[PDB]
């Protein structure tokens, strides 16, 4: 059930980094993207190009932002009177700063 002795620095090292299985291999399998000569994994669509395509689709197949009929011609003063902007809670604020906790896809290097 339990270790009989403190495992020596050597022994643990050799258990961990010793065998091949436990080592990270080098990703040899990667090649040029036909559309823009950047690196991409083999047998795999380039993540930039596809993303771009998706974006374009979104732009084209964008749904109509259903803006209400009343609020478009609603006086600024009137609006202020109606809907005064409150202070948001800490949690809400945190949620809002997406950049802090949310990751945007990185771009690869150019293959040569």
């Amino acid at each position: 059930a339990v270790p009989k002795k403190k495992v020596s620095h050597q022994k643990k090292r050799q258990k961990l980094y010793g065998p091949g299985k436990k080592q990270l291999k080098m990703i040899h399998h990667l090649n040029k993207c036909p559309s823009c000569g950047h690196y991409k994994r083999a047998n795999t669509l380039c993540m930039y190009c596809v993303g771009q395509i998706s974006h374009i689709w979104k732009t084209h197949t964008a749904k109509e932002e259903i803006k209400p009929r009343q609020e478009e011609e609603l006086s600024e003063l009137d609006q202020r009177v109606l809907y005064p902007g409150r202070r948001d809670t800490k949690y809400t604020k945190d949620l809002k700063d997406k950049d802090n906790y949310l990751e945007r896809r990185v771009r690869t290097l150019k293959k040569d």
Binding site: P34, N43, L45, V50, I53, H60, E103
Partner: protein, 229 residues
């Protein structure tokens, strides 16, 4: 039970629900992104559904027709945005594949997602019309778009087209009229140019497209095979 299909770490009913759902979504949107495994199974379903639809369209036997229809109904959730899906399958989707023998769906490997390392894929219907009127382009077939982009890049660089690219183009063509294909390419190209920084000369582009089509359409070791002495 063991080894007939994927299990996907879900009990029977739930799995079935998932797969039907995925099929429905694919029919709706033409292209979707999900985990590889899910895609792979979803395609199986979708293809089968398409074939059933085709059979229903074709076969003279009323009994057979009815049965196929029933099967199709069973294999879908026709409720919210899928309410008119039955109609869509027969009228819009199935006809595109009347001449094509299987292979109605295309699965393409993406990058594994960062947070989970789960291997992802695009699943999409093959020959999906890229141009809807009163809309410009449609949320269509990624592969075609990618090919077009590649072609554009090549043109920009003034390099010859890769053989692989040519092969892909040929494949795309096989079940496609030439003029139609050309039109589609043209439609794609302008949009791509707009997206990218590159400029757009219409006539020149058209010419290029024509050239590309022509090559596609009109077709053209150390070991010596010798008889036993």
């Amino acid at each position: 039970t063991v080894g007939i299909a994927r299990k996907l770490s879900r009990d029977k009913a739930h799995r079935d629900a998932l797969l039907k759902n995925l099929a429905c979504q694919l029919f709706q949107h033409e292209s979707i992104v999900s985990t590889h495994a899910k895609c792979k199974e979803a395609s199986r379903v979708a293809e089968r559904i398409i074939t059933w639809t085709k059979r229903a369209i074709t076969t003279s036997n009323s009994v057979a027709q009815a049965e196929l229809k029933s099967q199709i109904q069973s294999q879908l959730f026709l409720a919210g945005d899928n309410r008119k899906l039955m109609k869509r399958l027969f009228s819009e989707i199935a006809p595109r594949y009347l001449e094509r023998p299987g292979g109605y769906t295309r699965v393409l490997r993406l990058e594994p997602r960062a947070n989970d390392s789960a291997p992802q894929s695009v699943l999409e219907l093959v020959d999906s019309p890229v141009m809807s009127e009163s809309h410009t382009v449609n949320r269509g077939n990624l592969k075609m778009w990618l090919l077009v982009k590649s072609v554009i890049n090549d043109d920009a660089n003034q390099l010859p087209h890769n053989p692989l690219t040519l092969q892909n183009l040929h494949k795309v063509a096989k079940f496609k009229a030439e003029a139609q294909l050309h039109g589609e390419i043209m439609l794609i190209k302008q949009v791509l140019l707009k997206e990218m920084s590159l400029p757009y000369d219409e006539a020149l582009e058209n010419e290029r497209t024509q050239a590309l089509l022509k090559e596609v359409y009109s077709s053209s070791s150390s070991y010596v095979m010798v008889p036993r002495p």
